[PDB]
Every structure is written in C-alpha cells, then in structure tokens.
Design a protein around this motif. Structure first.
Motif, PDB file in Angstrom:
ATOM      1  N   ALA A 130       0.867  -1.269  -0.051  1.00  0.00           N
ATOM      2  CA  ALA A 130      -0.135   0.088   0.025  1.00  0.00           C
ATOM      3  C   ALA A 130       0.768   1.133   0.116  1.00  0.00           C
ATOM      4  CB  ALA A 130      -1.151   0.028   1.160  1.00  0.00           C
ATOM      5  N   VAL A 131       1.982   1.209   0.894  1.00  0.00           N
ATOM      6  CA  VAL A 131       2.870   2.237   1.028  1.00  0.00           C
ATOM      7  C   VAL A 131       3.598   2.516  -0.379  1.00  0.00           C
ATOM      8  CG1 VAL A 131       4.870   3.037   1.921  1.00  0.00           C
ATOM      9  CG2 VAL A 131       3.498   2.397   3.405  1.00  0.00           C
ATOM     10  N   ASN A 132       4.162   1.318  -1.023  1.00  0.00           N
ATOM     11  CA  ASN A 132       4.992   1.515  -2.146  1.00  0.00           C
ATOM     12  C   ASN A 132       3.734   2.010  -3.441  1.00  0.00           C
ATOM     13  OD1 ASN A 132       6.017  -0.220  -5.088  1.00  0.00           O
ATOM     14  ND2 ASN A 132       7.421   0.584  -3.635  1.00  0.00           N
ATOM     15  N   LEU A 133       2.522   1.489  -3.584  1.00  0.00           N
ATOM     16  CA  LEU A 133       1.586   1.845  -4.545  1.00  0.00           C
ATOM     17  C   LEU A 133       1.604   3.161  -4.733  1.00  0.00           C
ATOM     18  CD1 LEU A 133      -1.184  -0.993  -4.417  1.00  0.00           C
ATOM     19  CD2 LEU A 133       0.123  -0.327  -6.459  1.00  0.00           C
ATOM     20  N   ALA A 134       1.589   3.926  -3.457  1.00  0.00           N
ATOM     21  CA  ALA A 134       1.317   5.302  -3.219  1.00  0.00           C
ATOM     22  C   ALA A 134       2.518   6.421  -3.826  1.00  0.00           C
ATOM     23  CB  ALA A 134       0.701   5.806  -1.985  1.00  0.00           C
ATOM     24  N   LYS A 135       3.655   5.578  -4.081  1.00  0.00           N
ATOM     25  CA  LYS A 135       4.632   6.628  -4.642  1.00  0.00           C
ATOM     26  C   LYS A 135       4.733   6.437  -6.251  1.00  0.00           C
ATOM     27  CE  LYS A 135       7.405   5.470  -0.897  1.00  0.00           C
ATOM     28  NZ  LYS A 135       7.780   4.415  -0.162  1.00  0.00           N
ATOM     29  N   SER A 136       3.611   6.862  -6.822  1.00  0.00           N
ATOM     30  CA  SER A 136       3.282   6.818  -8.261  1.00  0.00           C
ATOM     31  C   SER A 136       2.849   8.139  -8.729  1.00  0.00           C
ATOM     32  CB  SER A 136       2.592   5.639  -8.531  1.00  0.00           C
ATOM     33  OG  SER A 136       1.322   5.820  -7.740  1.00  0.00           O
ATOM     34  N   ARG A 137       2.897   8.249 -10.104  1.00  0.00           N
ATOM     35  CA  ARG A 137       2.307   9.344 -10.599  1.00  0.00           C
ATOM     36  C   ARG A 137       0.752   8.966 -10.553  1.00  0.00           C
ATOM     37  NH1 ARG A 137      -0.701  10.647 -15.313  1.00  0.00           N
ATOM     38  NH2 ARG A 137      -0.428  13.027 -15.913  1.00  0.00           N
ATOM     39  N   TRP A 138       0.326   7.935 -10.806  1.00  0.00           N
ATOM     40  CA  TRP A 138      -1.242   7.409 -10.591  1.00  0.00           C
ATOM     41  C   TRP A 138      -1.753   7.861  -9.418  1.00  0.00           C
ATOM     42  CZ3 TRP A 138      -2.561   2.906  -7.125  1.00  0.00           C
ATOM     43  CH2 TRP A 138      -3.810   2.380  -7.234  1.00  0.00           C
ATOM     44  N   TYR A 139      -1.167   7.818  -8.174  1.00  0.00           N
ATOM     45  CA  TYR A 139      -1.497   8.420  -6.858  1.00  0.00           C
ATOM     46  C   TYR A 139      -1.488   9.678  -6.858  1.00  0.00           C
ATOM     47  CZ  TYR A 139      -1.913   8.672  -1.970  1.00  0.00           C
ATOM     48  OH  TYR A 139      -2.468   9.314  -0.583  1.00  0.00           O
ATOM     49  N   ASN A 140      -0.423  10.538  -7.204  1.00  0.00           N
ATOM     50  CA  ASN A 140      -0.347  12.066  -7.139  1.00  0.00           C
ATOM     51  C   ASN A 140      -1.530  12.516  -8.135  1.00  0.00           C
ATOM     52  OD1 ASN A 140       2.605  11.098  -6.245  1.00  0.00           O
ATOM     53  ND2 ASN A 140       1.831  13.123  -5.529  1.00  0.00           N
ATOM     54  N   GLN A 141      -1.842  11.983  -9.404  1.00  0.00           N
ATOM     55  CA  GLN A 141      -2.951  12.494 -10.135  1.00  0.00           C
ATOM     56  C   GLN A 141      -4.147  12.237 -10.180  1.00  0.00           C
ATOM     57  OE1 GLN A 141       0.234  14.453 -11.735  1.00  0.00           O
ATOM     58  NE2 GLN A 141      -1.664  14.680 -12.873  1.00  0.00           N
ATOM     59  N   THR A 142      -4.494  11.077  -9.460  1.00  0.00           N
ATOM     60  CA  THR A 142      -5.927  10.801  -9.076  1.00  0.00           C
ATOM     61  C   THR A 142      -6.008  10.013  -7.725  1.00  0.00           C
ATOM     62  OG1 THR A 142      -5.831   8.516 -10.364  1.00  0.00           O
ATOM     63  CG2 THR A 142      -6.837  10.404 -11.343  1.00  0.00           C
ATOM     64  N   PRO A 143      -5.525  10.878  -6.803  1.00  0.00           N
ATOM     65  CA  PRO A 143      -5.545  10.452  -5.587  1.00  0.00           C
ATOM     66  C   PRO A 143      -6.683   9.877  -4.849  1.00  0.00           C
ATOM     67  CG  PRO A 143      -5.601  12.784  -5.362  1.00  0.00           C
ATOM     68  CD  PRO A 143      -5.545  12.477  -6.795  1.00  0.00           C
ATOM     69  N   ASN A 144      -7.887  10.221  -5.021  1.00  0.00           N
ATOM     70  CA  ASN A 144      -9.003   9.704  -4.496  1.00  0.00           C
ATOM     71  C   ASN A 144      -9.354   8.248  -5.021  1.00  0.00           C
ATOM     72  OD1 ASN A 144     -10.489  12.959  -3.931  1.00  0.00           O
ATOM     73  ND2 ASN A 144      -9.498  11.795  -2.388  1.00  0.00           N
ATOM     74  N   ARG A 145      -9.343   8.283  -6.191  1.00  0.00           N
ATOM     75  CA  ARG A 145      -9.408   6.962  -6.589  1.00  0.00           C
ATOM     76  C   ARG A 145      -8.365   5.917  -6.190  1.00  0.00           C
ATOM     77  NH1 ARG A 145     -10.620   5.396 -13.110  1.00  0.00           N
ATOM     78  NH2 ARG A 145     -10.693   3.000 -12.803  1.00  0.00           N
ATOM     79  N   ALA A 146      -7.139   6.441  -6.572  1.00  0.00           N
ATOM     80  CA  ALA A 146      -5.791   5.518  -6.103  1.00  0.00           C
ATOM     81  C   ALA A 146      -6.017   5.114  -4.416  1.00  0.00           C
ATOM     82  CB  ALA A 146      -4.558   6.429  -6.243  1.00  0.00           C
ATOM     83  N   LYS A 147      -6.595   5.905  -3.591  1.00  0.00           N
ATOM     84  CA  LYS A 147      -6.695   5.808  -2.255  1.00  0.00           C
ATOM     85  C   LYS A 147      -7.704   4.644  -2.165  1.00  0.00           C
ATOM     86  CE  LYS A 147      -5.163  10.030  -0.532  1.00  0.00           C
ATOM     87  NZ  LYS A 147      -5.607  11.077  -0.303  1.00  0.00           N
TER      88      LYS A 147
END
Length: 164
Positions: A130-147
C-alpha cells in the motif's frame, strides 16, 4: 459489490464525448476513444466502435455494452500477461478486483511498471504494498481513486466503496 459496480463508481457514466482526467476523448463508462486531439478523430472512433453514425452521442445500452467488452478485455489481458497472471492467480476475489481496476485505468503496460508493488502483493505484504503503490504518478494524479484501490488491496474488503 462486484467489478462492474466498482468501476461504475470510479469512472461514472457519460453519454456524450468528454475528456478524461488526462484530457483524452472518452465516452460511456471510461471507454477511451483516442489519444488524438481531434474531436473528429474521436467521433470517427466512436462510430467504428458502435457500428452506427452517432454524432458524438450514445444510449445507456450502448455504454453498457462497451463496458462489458472493456471489462472482459481487461481480465483476458491480465490472464495473457506473464507479469500479471501470477499475481492475479495469487489473489483473493476482492483483491483481484483492485488489480482489474488498475488495468482498466492504465492498461497492462502501465500496471507492469509497478514491478515492486506487484512482488509485495504476491507475497501478501499488504501494508508494504500500500505504501509502495502510493509512490507513483497514478496516486499523485488521481489521489481519491488511487486511495480507494489501495485500501482495497490493503484490507481485502469493500470498505472504501461502501461509503460511495
């Protein structure tokens, strides 16, 4: 909750050509039409996809059909992929939905860059992944969905979507 209702929540439903978060021409339930800037190119892709002159607009039924095709193609893509298949096979049914969600949003190719995270999921190291997945463009760009997706891989429950 199932893969269809999950994606319907994340993607929404639009019956007229629209631009996605990346600015690409899309229609229905997250169905990418083209990465080209031309609305004309998009209208043409749309008509090719539906088999009629749509003039940039489709019905509910047409959107749902595209959606059935895309989910199926997403799963089939994972099963054919050497990097993805083994992770998928290792996961429980809820977590499999989280992986299908990523593939649907970013394609087989984009998911495949998550080498390190895929390894942790395989190993069932939930918190770490979960912590590794958050270190990505994906997470920074669509944070609510990524969460929501990340919470799903973390817990193995539908909690992040029971809100919604």
């Amino acid at each position: 909750m199932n893969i269809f209702e999950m994606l319907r929540i994340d993607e929404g439903l639009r019956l007229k050509i629209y631009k996605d978060t990346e600015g690409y021409y899309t229609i229905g339930i997250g169905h990418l039409l083209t990465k080209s800037p031309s609305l004309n190119a998009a209208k043409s892709e749309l008509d090719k996809a539906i088999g009629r002159n749509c003039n940039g607009v489709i019905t509910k039924d047409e959107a749902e059909k595209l959606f059935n095709q895309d989910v199926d193609a997403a799963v089939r893509g994972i099963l054919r992929n050497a990097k993805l298949k083994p992770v998928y096979d290792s996961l429980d049914a809820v977590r499999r939905c989280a992986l299908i969600n990523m593939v649907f949003q970013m394609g087989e190719t984009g998911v495949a860059a998550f080498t390190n995270s895929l390894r942790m999921l395989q190993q069932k190291r939930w918190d770490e992944a979960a912590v590794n997945l958050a270190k990505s463009r994906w997470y920074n760009q669509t944070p609510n969905r990524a969460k929501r997706v990340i919470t799903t891989f973390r817990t193995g429950t539908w909690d992040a979507y029971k809100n919604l």
